[model samples]
Target: ASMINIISRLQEVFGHAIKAAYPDLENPPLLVTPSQQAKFGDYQCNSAMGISQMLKTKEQKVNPREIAENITKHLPDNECIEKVEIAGPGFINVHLRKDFVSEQLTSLLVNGVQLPALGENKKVIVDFSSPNIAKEMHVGHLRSTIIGESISRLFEFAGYDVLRLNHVGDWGTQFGMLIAHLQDKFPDYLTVSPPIGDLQVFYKESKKRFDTEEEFKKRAYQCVVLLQGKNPDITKAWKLICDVSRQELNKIYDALDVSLIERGESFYQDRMNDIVKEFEDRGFVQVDDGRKIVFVPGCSIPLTIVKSDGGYTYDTSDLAAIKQRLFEEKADMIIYVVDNGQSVHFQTIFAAAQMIGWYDPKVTRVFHAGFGVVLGEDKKKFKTRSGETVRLMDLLGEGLKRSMDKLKEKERDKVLTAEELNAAQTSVAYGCIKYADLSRNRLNDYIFSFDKMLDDRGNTAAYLLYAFTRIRSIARLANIDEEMLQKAARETKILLDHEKEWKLGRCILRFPEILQKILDDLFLHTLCDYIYELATAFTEFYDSCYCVEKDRQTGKILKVNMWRMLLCEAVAAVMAKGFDILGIKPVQRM
Candidate 1:
């Protein structure tokens, strides 16, 4: 049976029991999360602690020790959960059965259980990576794009109807300056370089003329009107600008082997006016400071729909976008991969939409994926030696350059051809950058350092990749037949009491629950930590066993084949899952 089949029944039984005990109160079902350390039971549930506080406030003290003991006994008996013990201040520690570990690993080998499946038949719109027009993407944009893609992939792999929304900023007043410059520099001309990277310079030059020269400002202002689909010449110029930006973005996506389908701000321009009208008709729209506004309950600021100058805003566009997502896209959730600074903005927008009856908390939702900034070695905002913010391209290039230096230093005397050495350098370079970015907690600020991430002895991407390489080498030497391992997994006996085997078994059994936690919190760093633990467990097995090719008495290589199968199944799963979470490509050969 599926893991959820067992967990869901437990939830239902607990909910019913709670309601029976307190008919007048609401009883929400409780769930468990991963234990903080390996020594504690694999899982812990603290529902009794939360419920006990409520009971105490009502002039009745519900002893945590008694409640935990009662609930543990009341929980539906199953093979998955072996024994339960109450520890500390009413924490229920659950130890899983040993045989179940083998079963879980077998299922994962047959079908990847680590991939989430909660959104089996539901749709979601993930709106992210909305860099402003004419600005170079900074490290902030890198966080949004990479994290957003990981989230989208997680749902997609779980069988959700995922719409990877780029939400690119190809509209607004900024483009007026960009178009005006293009008109002056390459008027009535067209040029393409496969991907456009000069748009930043183009925008800055246009802004210079628009600010200093009166005539240029007039043309620039006029371009805005046309760009909004008013003037033919202006509209055409705007399209060219957007096309160039999209091409450049695609190149970066291609390099990372990631994909995105666009739903740019321009796409929602026309729909925005109707949304404002609908809100006004429904009395959801307000006027403040000569601009259209909507106030959501519990939010501090009002969502501005339109400025006094009749200029459209993201707030206006998002209102319409939410409606489209609910009715057209059929999304149950709308997650915005925006910075924490915009948390207030999203809260107000979500509130206003619900108040106007355009949507409700059930039908529509929005969440700001808040995160801290990437700091330099000195714990300040990341910047270059010249004191300017580091460009995204430069950061990635520096990662590659540092990795190359480390590789050459490590293997100065190794006998390898020039071509082979170059290949190794490229793999190390790409792996170092991608791994460093993913090694930290997603919600916290991470410091960038070349020395630490590239260290082969530490818990780095280089270390994990080399671990994978060693596992592959063992499989080759042992000549472990894949067909035999497949058959054995179906009817195999696992020696669970063996210390090395049990250590590896524990990590494999916890994979499903670990994935579910990330599904709720969107924390990739937890996944990184778990995979590192798995690698360490495998290393323990290697340190103890000697897989010789031939047995002394018997001609067969003995159970060396079994160890090879276990190692291959584990290393590949952990490495691939780690790569999936960080939006990185796995280098199989290197």
Candidate 2:
């Protein structure tokens, strides 16, 4: 009755049998994968040949076919498995019991979409969607924000204490340069709001002055020293710039439904010195080109901990971050959802942390959930016609416009009130953008195209949203109260004699396995693919079966069957959960 995956149950049975046969077997590779061909079986375990090979090395010769037979002999008496058979090359094909699968579906309706316990009360930190201050968030930060949110949601749903962190670029010499520029541009800046409305323009102009003007460049370096020293006026100026940038960045986050707590590089600034000293005392620091560095194995360049001018680099702050997350936050795992270009930086940082015993693989884990670039139709870096990096705000605004246009094309405005249409537009527009990014493997570059993502026929959010609307519309016509349906799920026996019904029930049951696989490897496309398939399965079921009845002579609409209505609700619930994980909002009426 416990919420263990059906596949895990089979694996447990096979593991017991293997352990019983070979007492010396430790951590055996019990290969239980979903069978690709339906004719073979529902699942297959291809461990007989390897088990036989290992036994032969010990002079205990055994044929693979005999090994398969022995495994079948040790199969447990669970009703989940209908039969076990040996196939070519000792493949153990497993066919599940139809009645047992039906019973599990009934249990699912009674219990809701509660997945198996997988996290075991572990604490994790997910660092993602980091953007620098005084710069507009461009298309480059979109992937990390969307992907990291989904990963965070998945872990939280799986019962882990997850810390969603935004490692924003809030500190460094750049702030000082910007503050100095602000002081010069507006002499009365302290008394009134500065004239600079766009931070990116301010940043670019500040860099130009720093590079060309001699006195301004000297003042910038001095400002960095003063800012690092915590001078009150300099710190006050730095805070204003950061506040303005935070206000700008938060608007984009609000649109995307992505939430993160700011734990910027500056948060670790005070502790940077002590962390560097600790590493230095531990003999991890070495001198290279008059700069303090740490040499990590497999890294071409040493990580510069401190420049010759005593300025700390990203390496110092990252080391401090790991120590704090491990010791203070009490995290069992730390996941960095950063860009693919930073692969070397994270690799060296993790390597150094391991050397200092801060990241012990036995007790703690670190992962760089790196994602690839977003390209245009030309297979080049995505940019606007003017060769400017596309702004996140512009991209989202375009999506909203296109979505609204589509709605008008379908004349949704005529049926929906002003507020209703606005809500639907927001949901559909944002959902399409987020799903388009999440549907692709995060490690691969995805093309940025509104036309493709908004297509209702493709694997886009519009398609899935339409599917959800269809199921909900069925419920609406049934006019069934949810409380009554709950009561029926508890009392009624769910029938699955129809092939389409059985297929949907089986597809719904694979939710836990799909989530577990995503947890194992942070690939969100797997979940996206599963969600699309679930939608397809429901469509097939709806196309083939009838949930509601009509009076024979009167042609009046009759109530829907309780079992079929519950199945529709189950499918809708699963789809909603999937969209929630992908950071896409599911609109009841598409």
Say which candidate scores most in lDDT.
2
The lDDT of model 1 is 0.69
* 532 Cα displacement, candidate 1 (Å): 1.7
lDDT of 1 at 259: 69
Total backbone collisions, model 2: 0
User: Taking the tens digit of each residue's C-alpha lDDT, what string does model 2 give over 1-590?
Assistant: 33457677788988888777666876766888777556887788877877877667655687888888887887767768889899997989988788887677777777877765553689989998998777667666888898899999999888888999999888777876788998988887777877677888889989999888999988998888888788987887888888889888889999998889999998998889998898899998898778998998778778888888787778888888988998999998999998899999999888888888876877787899998888999999998897887889989999899988888876574456653467668888998888998898898988989999999896999898878888888868666778877898887777777878877877887787888889878999989999999998898898888888876867666756778888888888888889999998887675
Residue 267 deviation, candidate 2, in Å? 0.5
- Model 1 collision count: 1
Q: Model 1: per-residue lDDT, tens digit, 166-203? A: 87777778887788887777766444322334777677
- Candidate 1 stretches greater than 4 Å from native: 1-54, 57-64, 67-77, 85-93, 112-120, 190-197, 284-290, 295-298, 385-389, 409-431, 545-564
lDDT measured at residue 496 in model 1 versus the true structure, 0 to 100:
58
TM-score of each model, paired residue for residue: 0.86, 0.95
Q: In terms of TM-score, which candidate is strongest?
A: 2
